[PDB]
Amino acid sequence: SLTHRKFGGSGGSPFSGLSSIAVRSGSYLDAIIIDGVHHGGSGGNLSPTFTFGSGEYISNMTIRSGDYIDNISFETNMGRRFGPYGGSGGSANTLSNVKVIQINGSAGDYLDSLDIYYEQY
Amino acid sequence: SLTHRKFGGSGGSPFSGLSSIAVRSGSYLDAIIIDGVHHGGSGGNLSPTFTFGSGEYISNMTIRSGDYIDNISFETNMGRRFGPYGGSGGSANTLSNVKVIQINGSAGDYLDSLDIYYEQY
Ligand SMILES: CC(=O)N[C@@H]1[C@@H](O)[C@H](O)[C@@H](CO)O[C@@H]1O
Ligand SMILES: CC(=O)N[C@@H]1[C@@H](O)[C@H](O)[C@@H](CO)O[C@@H]1O
């Protein structure tokens, strides 16, 4: 079962383990960089890093994909936008009104796949 | 509710967004450092950093907590261990036969709470 459980008290301010995203991109996503850790090849161009503020999370995302990840864009609950980055290949899929919790995937020379964990609202 | 969607193809090698964990601890967990990002206060002592290998994840975890997180230990599916770090206050809760996907939480001067997102087998 996918779930989650909270341990501890009621104080403090929320934080997320997913703190920043950048990509290398061209016609595809050559790489995704999650909390600074690089996944994929050295092709394409490196995007600026998007760093989530306090209480900020990805709320909407559009991913184009086929055999690889062709393109990513997202918007946060604070209305900030990342991308689009990549090309116009693949087919588009959108997450709307979510809170992204984690981003896993698979990669080689390019970013082959993404496994996005999220809450759907 | 935690859910997931995969996008892309079958190639490449798998990665996870959750790459490393360290803590600062004394009687409590003063901070948790996730993929190099510090959450919590300046108290306690800095632990070594645990870095996940390929295919490696937390499969068992013990958290002592009360108003704050008092102590954490975990074990991976590969038989590696992190901790125990912290003190003997609060009461223990253990997750077993899981796969930890992400670690969120709330922090001030200490680590108040942990929100663990995981698959429960
Ligand atoms: C000339 C140019 O821009 N080449 C890029 C290459 O760097 C990148 O690896 C690939 C996949 O994104 O997209 C283009 O082919
Ligand atoms: C016919 C078809 O599905 N073509 C897709 C292409 O649009 C996409 O750019 C590429 C990388 O994801 O994967 C396939 O080759």
Ligand SMILES: CC(=O)N[C@@H]1[C@@H](O)[C@H](O)[C@@H](CO)O[C@@H]1O
């Ligand atoms: C031998 C090897 O590394 N093959 C990978 C392949 O699995 C992956 O699909 C592709 C794009 O990331 O990059 C390389 O070609």
Ligand SMILES: CC(=O)N[C@@H]1[C@@H](O)[C@H](O)[C@@H](CO)O[C@@H]1O
């Ligand atoms: C002398 C010493 O080690 N003091 C530590 C303090 O730094 C830490 O903030 C607290 C909670 O973990 O535990 C101890 O009191």
Ligand SMILES: CC(=O)N[C@@H]1[C@@H](O)[C@H](O)[C@@H](CO)O[C@@H]1O
């Ligand atoms: C009566 C009680 O449960 N006290 C707990 C204590 O054991 C724990 O060390 C602290 C930090 O979590 O939170 C409370 O003060």
Ligand SMILES: CC(=O)N[C@@H]1[C@@H](O)[C@H](O)[C@@H](CO)O[C@@H]1O
């Ligand atoms: C206003 C503020 O930041 N207060 C926080 C409190 O919420 C948290 O419970 C505690 C332990 O982390 O540290 C601070 O006191």
